[PDB]
Structures are given as C-alpha cells and as structure tokens.
Design a protein around this ligand. Sequence first.
Ligand SMILES: OC[C@H]1O[C@@H](O[C@H]2[C@H](O)[C@@H](O)[C@H](O)O[C@@H]2CO)[C@H](O)[C@@H](O)[C@H]1O
Ligand SMILES: OC[C@H]1O[C@@H](O[C@H]2[C@H](O)[C@@H](O)[C@H](O)O[C@@H]2CO)[C@H](O)[C@@H](O)[C@H]1O
Lengths: 167, 166
Amino acid sequence: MQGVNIYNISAGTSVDLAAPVTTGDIVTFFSSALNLNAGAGNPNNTTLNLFAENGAYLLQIAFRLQENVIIFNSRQPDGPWLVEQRVSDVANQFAGIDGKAMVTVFDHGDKYQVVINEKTVIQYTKQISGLTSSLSYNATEETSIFSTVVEAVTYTGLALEHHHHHH
Amino acid sequence: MQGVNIYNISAGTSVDLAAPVTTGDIVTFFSSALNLNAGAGNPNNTTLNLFAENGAYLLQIAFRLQENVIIFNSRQPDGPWLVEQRVSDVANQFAGIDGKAMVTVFDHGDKYQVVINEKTVIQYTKQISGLTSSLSYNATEETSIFSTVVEAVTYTGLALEHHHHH
Ligand SMILES: OC[C@H]1O[C@@H](O[C@H]2[C@H](O)[C@@H](O)[C@H](O)O[C@@H]2CO)[C@H](O)[C@@H](O)[C@H]1O
Ligand SMILES: OC[C@H]1O[C@@H](O[C@H]2[C@H](O)[C@@H](O)[C@H](O)O[C@@H]2CO)[C@H](O)[C@@H](O)[C@H]1O
C-alpha cells in the first residue's frame, strides 16, 4: 500500500529507508535554502545519492557551481564512475524560486526522471538497476547549495498500471 | 508525462491546477508551522479542499481543535455537506514532528488515502468521484493550525498504460 516516509538528512550523512524506493516510486529532497554563491566545490558543492543495498550509486545528482553544471552518473561500489550525463547552468534550473528548492527523483524502472522544482531537467536512462535502500546528502556547511539539513520524503508502494492486451 | 507542480496557497484562497490530479496521483500540503493551541475554530480551524472540474468539493479535510477531531466530507458547491467521516485526537496525528507538518492525499480512484506526516489517518471512501482541478486552504490568521501560506505539491501523470501484443 501507499506510504509516506520522512527523513531529515544532515549534510555529510546518509540514511537507510524504512521502505525501499522501487519502480513507480518517488523521492523528493526539500532544501530550506538556495546558496547559488556558496564556496567552490571539490569538485562537488552538493551531491544527492540513491544507494542500492550493496552500496552502488544507483544515481548521484552532483551540483557544481564553479563548473556550473549538474552531473548525473552511477557506479558500482568497487567499480568506476560510468557515463556522465550533464545539465549546464545550475542557477537556471532553480530559476523562479529563491531561498529554497526541491529535487524530485521518479524511479520509472528503466529510467530516473529528475525534476528541479517544477522543471524536469533530465530523463536519465539507468546505468544500474535495482531498488534504492538508502539515501544521502553530502556537502560541507561552507559550500553546499542547500540547507544544513535536507528533508527527504519518499512516496512508496505507488506503482499503478493498466494492462491492455491485444492479439 | 509524470510531472511536479508547486503552488503557494495563502489562507482563504484557492488555486487552479496546471495538471489535474486523478487516480494514482498525489497532492501534499506543506505547512511551515503547527499551532495545536490556536484555540477554537469557527467551527473549523483549518480546511484543505480538493475541487473537481465541475466545482464539487471532492474532499475537505477539516481540523477542529475544540472538538479534537478531523472531519472528512464532500458536497456540491450549491448543495449540503454529505456524510461526515470523523477521526479523533488531532494532536496524535501530528505526533513526532513539531513546528511544521504535511498532509498527503493519494487518489486511489474509489477512495482518498489521507496521510499526516507518516501516519495514514483515513481511507476515505469517495462520496463524489472525479478529477481534482483546484485546491483551497481556508482559515483565519489567528486560529489556523498551519502557516499563513501553505505549499501544495502535486505529482501527476503517474498511472501507466501498459499495452501487451500477443
Ligand atoms: O561522475 C560523478 C563523479 O565525478 C567525479 O569527478 C569526475 C569529473 O566529473 C570528470 O569530468 C573527470 O573526468 O573525472 C572526475 C573523477 O576522477 C567526482 O570526483 C565524484 O565525486 C563524482 O561526482
Ligand atoms: O462536514 C464539513 C462541514 O461541516 C460544517 O459543519 C457541520 C457540523 O460539523 C455538523 O456536525 C452539523 O450537523 O452540520 C454542520 C453544517 O450545517 C461546517 O460548517 C462546514 O464549513 C464544513 O466544515
């Protein structure tokens, strides 16, 4: 059945989900601040990650102000970072809303749709499949583009399909 | 296409959705405050409403501190309120989180599942069916349990049509 779980993630920490995020599920990270002028990343200012039980980075959303880009990538816990998908102009993706923001990730089975506020910035074809068992928000107090603590809200058990058969 | 929409709603106003909420979709109201000591409503302290395209009150979630109850109901805009569904102990529903709150409504087609924070408060069997085309948040400045402005986020286009060819 459908359920809502709330997690308050401090910068530099991660949490295990009470209910895994799977195909048809949604997770939204809410930030109470938007620091588009934060310190220089190294090279990341902020990273939002969806982890598989084996620690694989199912999806990482990395924000880089200096390089002015949002990187989407995946990799096994002991494997190399895979093919990066980039979105230029970090500020433009958040335009329209200041002092706060939200990043939503839809798990569509074959792809991860990421939406910054109301704007879909990418339909990311998965490079690694599997259910998300933990989330993380990594950054330092001085260079994060988001608030010290980011609230993650997962909407699980959502999957709804209408099967139409033909022959 | 699945999509997220954000609407800031001031107490006593309503908003027209850019994308309607239908079966399988979600709408969550976020409050930057929680005032469970706001006093008696008139009779409601706060009401969250989902309106169908034809103007009907698909669902009203009404909080009453003096009655210590949450009332769920429906009605036609020119008609009488229908059969009230009640859930007692308002505080218990928001237990665990202070200074803020979220109310989530899942549209399951035949029923609306209301969730306060992480707790499912009710599986409301619909008295009126249809797609939600607008929302409203009514309350006064002094007696609302939520912040002056509530932020509603909709997740739409979620149901999927899966064709199989044999
Ligand atoms: O791909 C995510 C991953 O990127 C690393 O930095 C990459 C850099 O983006 C790429 O252009 C370069 O060729 O290789 C670097 C890694 O050696 C980040 O260091 C890492 O934290 C992730 O963000
Ligand atoms: O049902 C929501 C609706 O309730 C109205 O008040 C009701 C009251 O709760 C009920 O016990 C009584 O029998 O009828 C009243 C209506 O005549 C509120 O006035 C209305 O705003 C909604 O909150």
